[PDB]
């Protein structure tokens, strides 16, 4: 075959890979602390997202959307524009169970938070 794997490998990998578990260990272990971490040259994006598919990286919108820096307020659209279509992917909670820990837990968030705060500012809003 040109791509085949057993359930444990297939599902666990799919669920994990798609869900937060796979991405959790892969990105965590690969990246090493998601809160902190910034790369220069890149497709502008791809990785470090709340269970969102790596999409939305436009050609001409980079500045418009990537206005997060100055007009940091405007980016509010980036979420107010197409989100109403993703804001239905909530059931992912059950899958995104891990979303539960950081929700009903959260540790490697408050800490990096005090730095993030410094490393960026916090001058932002999130829901």
Ligand X SMILES: *SCC1=CC(C)(C)N(O)C1(C)C
Enumerate binding residues for ligand X (CB under 6 A). Answer: 27, 30-31, 45-50, 99, 102-103, 106
Question: Which of residues 4 and 104 has its CB atom nearest to ligand X in the complex?
Answer: 104
Question: Which of residues 89 and 99 has its CB atom nearest to ligand X in the complex?
Answer: 99
Q: Minimum distance between the CB of residue 86 and ligand X, rounded to whole angstroms?
A: 13
Whether the Cβ atoms of residue 38 and residue 47 lie closer than 8 Å to each other:
no
Question: Which of residues 7 and 64 has its CB atom nearest to ligand X in the complex?
Answer: 64
Using CA atoms, how far apart are residues 119 and 37, in angstroms rounded to an integer? 10
Q: Minimum distance between the CB of residue 11 and ligand X, rounded to whole angstroms?
A: 21
DSSP per-residue string spanning 20-61: HHHHHHHHHHHHS-SSS---SSSSS--S--SS--S----SSH
CB atoms under 10 Å from CB of 115, counted, come to 12
Q: Minimum distance between the CB of residue 108 and ligand X, rounded to whole angstroms?
A: 11
Question: Which of residues 3 and 7 has its CB atom nearest to ligand X in the complex?
Answer: 3
């Amino acid at each position: 075959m040109s791509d085949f794997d057993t359930e444990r490998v297939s599902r666990a990998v799919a669920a994990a890979l798609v869900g937060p578990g796979g991405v959790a260990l892969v990105v965590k272990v690969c990246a090493g602390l998601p809160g902190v971490i910034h790369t220069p040259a890149r497709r502008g994006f791809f990785r470090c997202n709340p269970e969102r598919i790596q999409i939305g990286d436009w050609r001409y919108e980079v500045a418009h959307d990537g206005r997060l820096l100055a007009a940091h307020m405007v980016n509010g659209i980036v979420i107010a524009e197409d989100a109403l279509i993703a804001e239905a992917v909530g059931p992912h909670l059950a899958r995104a169970l891990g979303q539960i820990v950081c929700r009903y837990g959260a540790t490697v968030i408050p800490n990096i938070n005090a730095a993030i705060e410094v490393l960026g500012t916090g001058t932002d809003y999130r829901f």
